[PDB]
Symmetry: C2
Subunit: 144 residues, 2 copies
């Protein structure tokens, strides 16, 4: 499988998901962990595409949920982010992408380690289309 960058942009506009989860994790000073992730889900008949996309980005995990390319490692997410800056998404995923990127930058620069940075991140995540709004709302309430 050989994939052309604009083919990848099209496929991700269609199938890709930029997500930021937050879970309780009382090890963290703040009490919470932010979990950004990028995911593309395909039926098993198309698992080849998932491996081809892993090869394209040079990183990621292909796993069964229905199989998934899931990217969690910040180094790998960085490559994803710089790909989509050079080759922008076309749908509303572009807007989720930009919030996703902003959170990733904040985390790389360690801003999530303060109460105020965590709060800022939660607010940005609540503006994304990818679920968990009520859940983000409830953790904002616990932090305050």
């Amino acid at each position: 499988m050989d994939l052309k960058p604009d083919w990848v942009v099209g496929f991700v506009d269609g199938e890709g998901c930029f997500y930021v989860g937050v879970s309780r994790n009382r090890t963290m000073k703040t009490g919470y962990q932010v979990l950004p992730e990028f995911r593309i889900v395909q039926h098993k008949r198309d698992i080849q595409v998932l491996y081809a996309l892993r090869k394209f980005f040079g990183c990621g995990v292909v796993r069964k949920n229905r199989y998934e390319l899931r990217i969690r490692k910040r180094s790998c997410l960085k490559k994803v982010v710089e790909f989509f800056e050079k080759h922008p998404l076309k749908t509303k995923k572009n807007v989720d992408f930009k919030k996703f990127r902003r959170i990733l930058i904040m985390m790389e620069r360690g801003e999530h380690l303060t109460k105020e940075g965590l709060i800022k991140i939660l607010e940005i995540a609540m503006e994304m289309n990818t679920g968990n709004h009520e859940r983000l709302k409830r953790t904002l309430e616990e932090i305050r």
Copy 2:
């Protein structure tokens, strides 16, 4: 917005559906009309993409689907022909290509008028049933009516 061909391929690989329906139609000697179509469904916030694809192909209708969803639907023979020739030039990468190839075979058959004959229509229904679309039991009932 303007789209690049490779982007269209990528997007259709992900979200495209090649559909072959059938309905009764008394004006046909065979008693039925095959209705191939290409559809792409999106949430309403991405309505703009549907109009971009419509502009890219230069044909098709954007319409409500259900609830908060909308569709680009391409049905007219002259438009389907433009879709077929596009994906001949720029092949799909996923197993959407298998559906596409079955879809193209059917349209080629329908251009040749094969749907006007019993055996030609039967063959079309049989190919449609090998496709990954949610219409099998309807195709099956139609074959039973025919026989």
